[PDB]
Amino acid sequence: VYPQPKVLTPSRKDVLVVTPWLAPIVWEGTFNIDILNEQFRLQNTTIGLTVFAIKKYVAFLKLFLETAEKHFMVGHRVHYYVFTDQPAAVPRVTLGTGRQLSVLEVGSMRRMEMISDFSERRFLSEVDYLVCVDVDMEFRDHVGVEILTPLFGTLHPSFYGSSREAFTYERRPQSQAYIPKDEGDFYYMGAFFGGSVQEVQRLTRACHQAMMVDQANGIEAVWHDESHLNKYLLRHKPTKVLSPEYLWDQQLLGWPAVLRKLRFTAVP
Amino acid sequence: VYPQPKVLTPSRKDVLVVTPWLAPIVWEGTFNIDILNEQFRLQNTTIGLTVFAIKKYVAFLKLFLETAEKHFMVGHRVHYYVFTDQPAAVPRVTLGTGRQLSVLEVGSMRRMEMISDFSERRFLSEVDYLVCVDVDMEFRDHVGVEILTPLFGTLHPSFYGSSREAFTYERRPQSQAYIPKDEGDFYYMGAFFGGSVQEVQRLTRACHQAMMVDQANGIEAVWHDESHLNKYLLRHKPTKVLSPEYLWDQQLLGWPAVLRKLRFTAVP
Numbered sequence: 001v002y003p004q005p006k007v008l009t010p011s012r013k014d015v016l017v018v019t020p021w022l023a024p025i026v027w028e029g030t031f032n033i034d035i036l037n038e039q040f041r042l043q044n045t046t047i048g049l050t051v052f053a054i055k056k057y058v059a060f061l062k063l064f065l066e067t068a069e070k071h072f073m074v075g076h077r078v079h080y081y082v083f084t085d086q087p088a089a090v091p092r093v094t095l096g097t098g099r100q101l102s103v104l105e106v107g108s109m110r111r112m113e114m115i116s117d118f119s120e121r122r123f124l125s126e127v128d129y130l131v132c133v134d135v136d137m138e139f140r141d142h143v144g145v146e147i148l149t150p151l152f153g154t155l156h157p158s159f160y161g162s163s164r165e166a167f168t169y170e171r172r173p174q175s176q177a178y179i180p181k182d183e184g185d186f187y188y189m190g191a192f193f194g195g196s197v198q199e200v201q202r203l204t205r206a207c208h209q210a211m212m213v214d215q216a217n218g219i220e221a222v223w224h225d226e227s228h229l230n231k232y233l234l235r236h237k238p239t240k241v242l243s244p245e246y247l248w249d250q251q252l253l254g255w256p257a258v259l260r261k262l263r264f265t266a267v268p
Numbered sequence: 269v270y271p272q273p274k275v276l277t278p279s280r281k282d283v284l285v286v287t288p289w290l291a292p293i294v295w296e297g298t299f300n301i302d303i304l305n306e307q308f309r310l311q312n313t314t315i316g317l318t319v320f321a322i323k324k325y326v327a328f329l330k331l332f333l334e335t336a337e338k339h340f341m342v343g344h345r346v347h348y349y350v351f352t353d354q355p356a357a358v359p360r361v362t363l364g365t366g367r368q369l370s371v372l373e374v375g376s377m378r379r380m381e382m383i384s385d386f387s388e389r390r391f392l393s394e395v396d397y398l399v400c401v402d403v404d405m406e407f408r409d410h411v412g413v414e415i416l417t418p419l420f421g422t423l424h425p426s427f428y429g430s431s432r433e434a435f436t437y438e439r440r441p442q443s444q445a446y447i448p449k450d451e452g453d454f455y456y457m458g459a460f461f462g463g464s465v466q467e468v469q470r471l472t473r474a475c476h477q478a479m480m481v482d483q484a485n486g487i488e489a490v491w492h493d494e495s496h497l498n499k500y501l502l503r504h505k506p507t508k509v510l511s512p513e514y515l516w517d518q519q520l521l522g523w524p525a526v527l528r529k530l531r532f533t534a535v536p
């Protein structure tokens with residue numbers, strides 16, 4: 001049992017909660033997690049989390065994993081895949097039941113290339129969704145099954161209020177990432193995207209293949225794989241969009257009125 | 269090219285536009301049909317429309333089909349399936365290109381039983397979605413691909429503002445349609461539901477099988493197949509919900525403030 005929905009009360013009066021192609025934009029107050037938890041537990045949903053920790057960024061893993069244990073997908077099956085050039089530096093963090101961690105030794109194109117190769121491996125047969133995040137981050141509040149859908153991106157925290165001409169899309173037509181000044185729905189950040197395994201195979205292959213074309217042509221998109229992620233999600237629109245609750249920098253941007261929760265935040 | 273979404277402007281301030289399980293509730297101003305038309309034309313989407321016209325209700329077919337030609341899924345592939353006990357009384361309405369009509373001779377349980385049998389037939393191999401509507405209705409405004417999703421129901425026009433204890437669910441526990449007083453999200457009407465062919469196979473089989481159980485037990489649910497449709501959509505929640513724009517009675521209920529468009533309306 002849970003509260004009845006209120007047809008004549010808006011979930012939010014201050015923000016857009018559904019895109020013009022009818023994908024939910026996920027903010028606090030738009031979902032009842034008790035309903036979603038039951039839906040996804042009935043399918044025994046398993047979520048894979050990829051994170052890269054190369055060179056000095058191995059230092060971020062301890063807090064990243066400790067705080068993921070408190071706030072990411074708790075109660076669901078989770079498998080962490082840590083891609084790193086220093087496997088001995090992976091901290092031994094104690095995980096809750098139903099949660100596992102694998103270390104994948106590596107191994108600008110690297111993240112799309114490596115997630116593409118990995119996403120095609122038969123050892124993911126049991127994993128239903130992949131979530132791909134930056135490591136220099138911590139979880140401060142719930143990040144759960146409300147994000148899961150065939151394909152999602154996350155609104156970049158510096159640009160959610162910006163008009164599209166101000167978005168830092170790739171603007172040179174000789175790049176595979178090019179987006180004209182009069183096109184674009186949102187500016188998505190490269191630091192949190194995901195979807196079903198099949199949709200993440202598709203996105204990461206397309207971005208990697210596009211990056212290889214630009215390399216052959218002697219061009220590097222302005223924001224590297226984030227430029228390619230934005231061209232891809234313009235042409236293949238996501239089935240949910242995460243609000244900046246899911247990707248925030250409090251030191252830079254504070255705690256604005258429209259953020260009811262700060263869920264996953266940058267570490268200085 | 270089309271208008272950029274406005275992250276900091278709500279699509280509506282007067283109505284709920286997403287359910288608590290993140291299914292869009294489809295109202296005017298929540299979608300840009302130009303974006304959705306392109307998505308669904310890229311898949312060469314074909315929509316099957318079932319309607320029953322038995323006994324005196326054959327009289328409603330002429331306006332139903334004429335107005336469907338003006339307003340339902342125009343530009344997409346459509347196949348009408350008219351279930352009737354009087355095939356000669358089916359009016360010969362001229363259809364737009366890419367649109368076809370078949371007459372299926374029949375043939376309280378009938379609609380769920382007949383849509384179930386029909387939805388399993390291999391001659392639907394090309395049809396992607398089924399939309400199942402009442403015939404004593406006319407289209408007055410756009411009904412298009414914004415409704416298409418794996419499973420949808422429509423908010424009943426007499427009950428969208430009601431609390432759940434006032435919903436006319438089946439309340440006897442000896443019926444397969446039973447819903448307790450403290451359960452229920454919405455009251456859906458039996459006059460407009462649909463989804464992919466697979467989800468409509470599932471819904472109509474479950475409702476028909478439940479109706480056969482109640483018959484064996486000497487019970488008939490209070491509102492017949494609408495009671496069973498509501499029990500099914502409580503346990504298998506729809507992936508979009510249509511607002512009462514899609515199922516309205518202007519003579520009964522006027523043109524209230526929250527209705528920007530009256531799309532599919534009852535005939536007296």
Ligand SMILES: O=c1ccn([C@@H]2O[C@H](COP(=O)(O)OP(=O)(O)O)[C@@H](O)[C@H]2O)c(=O)[nH]1
Binds near residue numbers: 028033289
């Ligand atoms: O438009 C809404 C309003 C609420 N909720 C969620 O449904 C649950 C209960 O909502 P309610 O506002 O009734 O909160 P309560 O006052 O009972 O604590 C919470 O998880 C809300 O975030 C939602 O998904 N959509």
Ligand SMILES: O=c1ccn([C@@H]2O[C@H](COP(=O)(O)OP(=O)(O)O)[C@@H](O)[C@H]2O)c(=O)[nH]1
Binds near residue numbers: 020279
């Ligand atoms: O929150 C919104 C606002 C608008 N639209 C749709 O996007 C298109 C353009 O919206 P706009 O309000 O900019 O209308 P305009 O003033 O350009 O006629 C129309 O189909 C709107 O219904 C939408 O899907 N969600």
Ligand SMILES: OC[C@H]1O[C@H](O)[C@H](O)[C@@H](O)[C@H]1O
Binds near residue numbers: 226
């Ligand atoms: O430092 C440059 C990087 O900035 C972000 O982390 C962005 O998501 C990456 O694609 C890359 O452009």
Ligand SMILES: OC[C@H]1O[C@H](O)[C@H](O)[C@@H](O)[C@H]1O
Binds near residue numbers: 490
């Ligand atoms: O007249 C009774 C009928 O009323 C509505 O049309 C309802 O959707 C049907 O299931 C049936 O109960």
Ligand SMILES: [Mn+2]
Binds near residue numbers: 135
């Ligand atoms: Mn980062």
Ligand SMILES: [Mn+2]
Binds near residue numbers: 402459
């Ligand atoms: Mn009717």
